[PDB]
Amino acid sequence: TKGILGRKIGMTQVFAENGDLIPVTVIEAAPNVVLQKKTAENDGYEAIQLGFDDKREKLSNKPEKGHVAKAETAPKRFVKELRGVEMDAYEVGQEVKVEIFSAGEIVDVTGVSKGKGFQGAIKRHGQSRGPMSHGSRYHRRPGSMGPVDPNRVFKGKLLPGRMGGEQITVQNLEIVKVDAERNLLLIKGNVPGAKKSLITVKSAVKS
């Protein structure tokens, strides 16, 4: 199980072989570096802390500078584990560049959802609108909490509130093409998140 997480930039259409139109998401993906390798006999679990997008030392904290010093790598932003990698997989500090993923592989995708902002229940949960006519003042509002006998609102009862900004999996997306020279991924289907947001590219469950 491998996952080269990277920011998307723009939606694209890509046709190949067959004349059918295939929607495609661009992903910056590579390069990535193994900052650390977790061990079950010490750290208690198997994982690899891959980073993404290196940055200037000015933005880096001193303790962060030491963490990458073991990796023999310049300081770098976001870091995520990907249980469960097939150890030993890679030597510590080895670079990765889209080499693992073939076009035929199925790939799960996870990442933060685009913020819809604070919103009503109809957007948040798909609840039907109330009547707009026949003298009815009622519309858009969530409606009754429920039974009088409990004398309390049930927990988990739907109410309007902020939505988005939460991590959300999208399973079984498929890659279309591979561009290692440009470090580009080309996964078929919609990929969740705001433009230029970080996006994991974990291997899909099989089979």
């Binding site: 723009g10 694209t12 259409q13 890509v14 046709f15 004349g19 139109l21 561009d179 580009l184």
Partner: protein
Amino acid sequence: QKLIEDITKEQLRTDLPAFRPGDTLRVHVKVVEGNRERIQIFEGVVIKRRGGGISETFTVRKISYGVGVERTFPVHTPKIAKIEVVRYGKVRRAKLYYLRELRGKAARIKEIRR
């Protein structure tokens, strides 16, 4: 979108003739009825000309047996073979949606030869 432009370039179709939105071009399209591919000619007036690289599309339209047909063609699709602009036409706008309702001689008024 300079990176996005780099991807689209590989699938770019420079062979297609340049044309104004208002003209009666004839797209050729192979159809896999199985197994042989029939070539169905389809003349008509283009209307929409949405941008966006490979995603660009145009809406050729034709009356047929007393009823019109709106068959959109993406600009860079492989399925197109050749395009022949039988007639050019002056257009005061870019989105000629109105002409479809203006059967029938009135539609020809916007189809003046150039």
